[PDB]
Amino acid sequence: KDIGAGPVASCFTTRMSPPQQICLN
Amino acid sequence: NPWTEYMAKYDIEEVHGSGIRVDLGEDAEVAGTQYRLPSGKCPVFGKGIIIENSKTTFLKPVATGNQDLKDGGFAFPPTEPLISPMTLNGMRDFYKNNEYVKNLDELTLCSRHAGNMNPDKDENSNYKYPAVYDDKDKKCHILYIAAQENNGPMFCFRPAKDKSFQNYVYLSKNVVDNWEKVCPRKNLENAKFGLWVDGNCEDIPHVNEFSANDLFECNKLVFELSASDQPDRYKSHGKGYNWGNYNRKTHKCEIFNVKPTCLINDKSYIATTALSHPIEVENNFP
16 A cells, blocks of 8 residues: 555446446456 | 746646655545555656566556456556547547546546546545556556556566657646646756856756766656655655756766756756656757
8 A cells, every 4th residue: 555556446437427337348 | 036937847846746756645545445646746758667677568458357467567457438548539539528628638638537537436536547648659548556666675566767668658647737838848958957046047056966878868867866755754745856957968967856946058968857758858048
């Protein structure tokens, strides 16, 4: 975490409208 | 000081405000856990990540599922709809209905596009992935891995300015939309940075001389010594050896860590910064 180790994420939700779900694969 | 306005883009603590070599200037939370993340306000021209000697690996997608970290790069793996890598025209089309985003310059657009992807189920998470814009291919690569250095005596990697990275631009979530006006890009030919004292531009009083074959090597050295957030105690806030005066006659990179407040017109010099592109020059002494 001190070197920038990040979260484990499989799906992303767009912040800007319209909100949509973007998933890996 | 008649140089105030012109010199504002060289006040790296003010304009950039985070590390350059390693930028981890903010913290953000994803599902109750705190993470460090890039936060510099300027684009860093020519920065890439070298992985275990490899130069063509970091923009490859990250390891997927039952894959080892060393089998992949740092970039977002394939998504549906495909959002990384994305060409400039691809991003402009993706955001065609959003008037506040669709006409942003390519670097700000790439930063905003990477920053649009929330990894948390909570809409209020401030975690925003950094990105790399490749000027050769006009492609925005969102970086899944925000880490920039893991060195010392696997997955070993370090930031660098390498000839293979010359067209890359490293972008945090905070890149400002007017970077063209407020951030460094071009090296200043026939100019050397100085300090304004009682109506005259004086030389930087103390510099650290490193030998350099050419301007690229000087820019690379300044980058190596620049502000680094690598281990709040670790945060540089942009303080460091961010500037160099390259003497092209003596092949010396005069590196220093105080902001410059004027320019001296000197034909033997080129003024560079750790943010600046490693090749491009401007020959218009103001």
